[PDB]
Design a binder for this molecule. Sequence first.
Ligand code: NA
Lengths: 102, 100, 107, 107
Amino acid sequence: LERSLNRVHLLGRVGQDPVLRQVEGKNPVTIFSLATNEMQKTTWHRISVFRPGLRDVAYQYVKKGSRIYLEGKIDYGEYMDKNNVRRQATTIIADNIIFLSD
Amino acid sequence: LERSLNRVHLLGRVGQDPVLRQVEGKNPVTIFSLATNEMWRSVSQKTTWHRISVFRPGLRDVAYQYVKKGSRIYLEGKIDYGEYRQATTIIADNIIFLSD
Amino acid sequence: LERSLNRVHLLGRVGQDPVLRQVEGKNPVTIFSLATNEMWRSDVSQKTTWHRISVFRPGLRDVAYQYVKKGSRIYLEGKIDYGEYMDKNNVRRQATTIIADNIIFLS
Amino acid sequence: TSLVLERSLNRVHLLGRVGQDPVLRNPVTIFSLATNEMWRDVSQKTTWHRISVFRPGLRDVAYQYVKKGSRIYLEGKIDYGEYMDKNNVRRQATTIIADNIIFLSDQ
DNA sequence: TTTTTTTTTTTTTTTTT
Ligand code: NA
């Protein structure tokens, strides 16, 4: 079968402290938000880190205000809202993170 | 002042012929869909559908004229979440034709 | 009563199209940048000195705004001025300019 | 190392009074020179130039014979001494790098 | 869902002890 490509790279600033989500059914995931600012037009990205090891590094060292570079893939995710309606959410699943500030 | 990066690279198959729209108060904008696939087992393919927008003058003409249903292309651009809810789109600034 | 001398002569290449700066309370002035380049062989190195040129004199100010262009080669003469301005934080800063009183077009 | 390709000119001529005794700082002899313009009662505008003498030999001549209140003629080139301050903002430290000095009188 | 932070796009090439 022919192959495809789905890769993203981002460089920006973290909006809030990361959170480590553990759902009884599923693997743990580190979640945080990343702003990429054109200069002001700000784009807010939802980052997910599933990969073991990087997930814990991200949870330990990513902080509010941190500048980071990351690489990953785009995922158009799904969730049920409070009314149990099938919703759409986009996340960047990161597989490499480089820390850029102290 | 401080610089950011927001770049996407996609390579996949176009879903339908492109169309011309007004988007974000700008027009014309050339819109089409692109599928990228991943192999999974435990074989089968997970298809990710991307909404591609071409705002750039000239390139939007190229996209409308030459991108076709079932075309294979490589493209580059930036992510815009098209919020109002989300309507995520890849705003393309580079397109390489591979096969039709 | 004793007299001084403050003269500079430059021959070089213009870096950008000139601007006619007009400020409330001030005389108009034509501004542009001039590079004086030195190329040296040991393989070939370059040293570029970038000068800020101001033209206040009427007539020459308008000739300079009309005919000085990015990339133009020119000879000029003038005097050195260590000008003062204030940044956003109200700190006194220095900006050097060559106040030109003669310009000869070479290209 | 010799000059090649398109040539430029960067030459300053000053005549004025030395402000303080020169000091030693690639050793370099440094001093200040005042050039004055008359303006209209009758007032003066003083321009203070930072003189650097890098050239061997002449740097020692300057340190030995240039004194506070000396009147001199000098020639050289402008160097803007660009650098980065604490916040990565470009600053100037303009200096006239002198290569010819003619003594006129001292106090 | 709310949220982040601040180093940045000037020159030419017919010729030189
Ligand atoms: Na700054």
